[PDB]
Coordinates of C-alpha atoms in Angstrom, one line a residue:
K1 CA -45.1 -75.4 2.9
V2 CA -47.7 -73.9 4.5
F3 CA -49.5 -76.8 6.8
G4 CA -52.9 -78.1 8.0
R5 CA -53.6 -78.2 11.7
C6 CA -54.1 -81.6 11.8
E7 CA -51.2 -82.4 9.3
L8 CA -48.6 -80.8 11.5
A9 CA -50.4 -82.6 15.2
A10 CA -49.3 -85.3 12.9
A11 CA -46.1 -84.3 12.0
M12 CA -44.6 -82.4 15.4
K13 CA -46.4 -86.2 17.1
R14 CA -44.7 -88.3 15.3
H15 CA -41.5 -85.4 15.8
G16 CA -41.3 -86.9 19.6
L17 CA -42.5 -83.4 20.9
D18 CA -46.5 -84.8 21.9
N19 CA -46.0 -84.4 25.6
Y20 CA -41.4 -83.2 25.9
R21 CA -40.3 -81.9 28.4
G22 CA -45.1 -82.5 29.7
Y23 CA -45.9 -80.5 27.0
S24 CA -49.0 -82.2 25.2
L25 CA -49.5 -81.9 21.3
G26 CA -51.5 -78.7 21.5
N27 CA -49.6 -76.6 23.1
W28 CA -47.0 -77.2 19.8
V29 CA -49.4 -76.6 18.0
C30 CA -51.4 -73.6 18.9
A31 CA -47.7 -72.2 19.8
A32 CA -47.3 -72.4 16.3
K33 CA -50.4 -71.0 14.9
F34 CA -48.8 -67.9 16.2
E35 CA -45.7 -67.4 15.6
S36 CA -45.7 -68.8 12.0
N37 CA -49.7 -69.9 11.2
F38 CA -48.1 -72.8 10.1
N39 CA -45.8 -71.5 7.1
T40 CA -42.8 -72.9 7.1
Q41 CA -41.1 -70.1 5.4
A42 CA -42.8 -67.3 7.8
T43 CA -39.1 -65.0 9.3
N44 CA -39.2 -61.7 11.1
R45 CA -37.0 -59.0 12.6
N46 CA -36.1 -58.8 15.9
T47 CA -35.6 -54.4 17.3
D48 CA -32.2 -56.3 19.0
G49 CA -31.4 -57.3 15.0
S50 CA -31.7 -61.1 15.9
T51 CA -34.3 -62.3 12.7
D52 CA -37.4 -66.1 13.9
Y53 CA -36.8 -68.5 11.4
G54 CA -39.9 -71.2 10.4
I55 CA -42.9 -72.8 12.0
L56 CA -42.0 -71.9 15.6
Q57 CA -40.5 -69.0 14.5
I58 CA -37.0 -70.0 16.5
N59 CA -34.2 -67.5 16.6
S60 CA -30.3 -66.3 15.4
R61 CA -29.5 -64.3 18.7
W62 CA -29.2 -67.7 20.3
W63 CA -30.3 -70.8 18.0
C64 CA -28.9 -70.6 14.8
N65 CA -26.9 -69.2 12.4
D66 CA -27.6 -66.6 9.8
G67 CA -24.3 -64.8 9.3
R68 CA -25.8 -61.8 10.3
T69 CA -26.6 -60.9 14.3
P70 CA -23.9 -60.1 16.1
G71 CA -22.9 -62.1 18.8
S72 CA -25.2 -64.0 18.7
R73 CA -24.5 -68.3 18.9
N74 CA -26.1 -71.2 17.1
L75 CA -26.8 -73.7 19.5
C76 CA -28.1 -76.0 17.3
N77 CA -26.2 -75.7 14.8
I78 CA -27.9 -75.2 12.1
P79 CA -27.9 -72.2 9.7
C80 CA -31.2 -70.6 10.6
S81 CA -32.0 -71.6 6.2
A82 CA -33.2 -75.1 7.6
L83 CA -35.4 -73.7 10.0
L84 CA -38.0 -73.1 7.0
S85 CA -37.9 -76.3 5.0
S86 CA -41.0 -78.2 4.5
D87 CA -39.6 -80.6 6.9
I88 CA -39.6 -79.5 10.3
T89 CA -37.4 -82.1 11.1
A90 CA -34.6 -79.2 12.1
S91 CA -37.7 -76.8 13.4
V92 CA -38.3 -79.8 16.2
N93 CA -35.2 -80.4 17.5
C94 CA -34.2 -77.7 17.9
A95 CA -37.6 -76.8 20.2
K96 CA -36.2 -79.6 21.8
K97 CA -33.2 -77.7 22.8
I98 CA -34.7 -74.4 23.4
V99 CA -37.6 -75.5 25.4
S100 CA -35.2 -77.6 27.6
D101 CA -33.6 -74.7 28.3
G102 CA -34.9 -73.9 32.2
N103 CA -38.3 -72.2 31.1
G104 CA -40.3 -74.0 29.1
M105 CA -42.0 -72.7 26.3
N106 CA -42.4 -69.6 28.6
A107 CA -38.9 -68.9 25.8
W108 CA -41.6 -68.4 23.5
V109 CA -43.6 -65.3 24.4
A110 CA -46.8 -66.5 22.2
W111 CA -47.1 -69.3 23.6
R112 CA -46.9 -67.4 27.7
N113 CA -49.0 -64.5 26.2
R114 CA -52.2 -66.2 23.6
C115 CA -51.1 -70.7 24.7
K116 CA -50.6 -70.9 28.2
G117 CA -53.8 -71.8 30.8
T118 CA -55.6 -71.5 27.8
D119 CA -57.7 -75.2 26.4
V120 CA -54.7 -76.1 24.1
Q121 CA -56.5 -79.3 22.7
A122 CA -59.1 -77.5 21.3
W123 CA -55.5 -77.6 18.6
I124 CA -55.5 -81.4 18.2
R125 CA -59.9 -81.3 18.2
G126 CA -60.6 -84.2 15.0
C127 CA -58.2 -84.9 14.6
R128 CA -56.9 -88.1 12.9
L129 CA -53.4 -89.4 15.5

């Protein structure tokens, strides 16, 4: 599913992301934008052989099981498949764990490179929230 910008902001809010660990809603929407372009079925192979999954491009080395990343973990205790459904619950629950891991949203390289210190509130302008 390819979400609308405000449609994603709303689902993210309903799922408790707005200000989770101090990150306002605009940060999460900005990160989703640059990670997947709001497409839940986005996947991307990393050099080390792990794979990134779904709206927030959550990785198979630490966070999910795809059965094809030697030496990896599944700390969110889900199949990586679950990160590609229309339903974002699994992705949100798994992002909550990642963002709590010590580095805040720096765990997402595109957030640090493209959202950090920008006017992230732009990403929720004109949304019914």
